[PDB]
Design a protein around this ligand. Structure first.
Ligand SMILES: [Zn+2]
Lengths: 60, 97, 148
């Protein structure tokens, strides 16, 4: 019954970064986003979100 | 000792009307606004335009590009298409020279 | 007159975070006889400044200091009417921010004045008594002369 926990979570949801420390709640559980490829002006900048406190800060 | 101008002065002359705008540079640290030196910027990474003059900051994509809330957008919405056209032409000619 | 502020400062730190620009260095100063904190950006190429340097800082509304109002336009040929040229470094700028530590409930006890000299920024902290003369969006001359 403990093994069928690991059997059927799935969904591959979190990417498990755990690298960037937050600036509001100071928690490292975060995920990053890679959008806006190429184009005229905007370069790819990773947008990282902390789930627990909702803070978003740019990679810069 | 000698009369020296700054590029911010010339670009403030380029800026038309009395546009008020606040943007941030791409290399702006995330900890400057929280801690001290919020309005006295070490890296000059906070763009502040007051009364049509460039007080501080370094211009980049995020202030002069095709994004909402940019200096060009506020210039359009506050002055009109004729003055924004003159703004574009003046920026390109002065900076290219 | 038009002298809003006048004191002698001591250079304590030059670029504590690190050098961010080649020709501009940010220096922190503590005054004496007023206990004024100060952050100033200077053109280090034209005006070299070392640690432990003493200079006299004068904040003036006009250079003529005869009550004549300035037009804010560069008029180099009218150097005749006895401008204040006893200082080595003269800067021109506009004050843009005034900060108070108070919560606007009873009164204000300390003031911070933020002046931008064409992008060269300066903050001056201290008591409100010596900062009363600063008004937002006014145009301010900065004058320094190194003291030996
Ligand atoms: Zn979000």
């Amino acid at each position: 019954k403990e093994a069928i926990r690991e059997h059927q979570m799935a969904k591959t949801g979190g990417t498990q970064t755990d690298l960037f420390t937050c600036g509001k709640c100071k928690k490292k559980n975060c995920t990053y986003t890679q959008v806006q490829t190429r184009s005229a002006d905007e370069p790819m900048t990773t947008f990282v979100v902390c789930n627990e406190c909702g803070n978003r800060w740019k990679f810069c | 000792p000698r009369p020296l101008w700054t590029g911010k002065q010339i670009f403030s002359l380029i800026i038309p009307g009395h546009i008020n705008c606040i943007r941030t540079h791409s290399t702006h640290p995330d900890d400057e606004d929280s801690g001290p030196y919020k309005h006295i910027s070490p890296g000059d990474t906070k763009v502040v335009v007051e009364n049509g003059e460039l007080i501080m900051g370094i211009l980049c994509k995020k202030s002069l590009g095709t994004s909402a809330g940019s200096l060009v957008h506020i210039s359009y919405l506050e002055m009109g298409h004729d003055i924004t056209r003159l703004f574009y032409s003046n920026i390109q000619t002065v900076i290219n020279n | 007159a038009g002298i809003l502020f006048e004191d002698i400062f001591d250079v304590k730190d030059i670029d504590p975070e690190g050098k961010k620009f080649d020709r501009v260095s940010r220096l922190h100063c503590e005054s004496e006889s007023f206990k004024m904190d100060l952050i100033l950006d200077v053109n280090i190429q034209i005006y070299p400044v070392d640690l432990g340097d003493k200079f006299r800082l004068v904040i003036a509304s006009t250079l003529y200091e005869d009550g004549t109002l300035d037009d804010g336009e560069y008029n180099p040929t009218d150097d005749r009417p006895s401008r204040a040229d006893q200082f080595e470094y003269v800067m021109y700028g506009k004050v843009y921010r005034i900060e108070g530590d108070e919560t606007s409930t009873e009164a204000a006890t300390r003031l911070s004045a933020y002046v931008s000299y064409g992008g060269l920024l300066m903050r001056l902290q201290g008591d409100a008594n010596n900062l009363h003369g600063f008004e937002v969006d006014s145009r301010v001359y900065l004058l320094m002369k190194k003291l030996a």
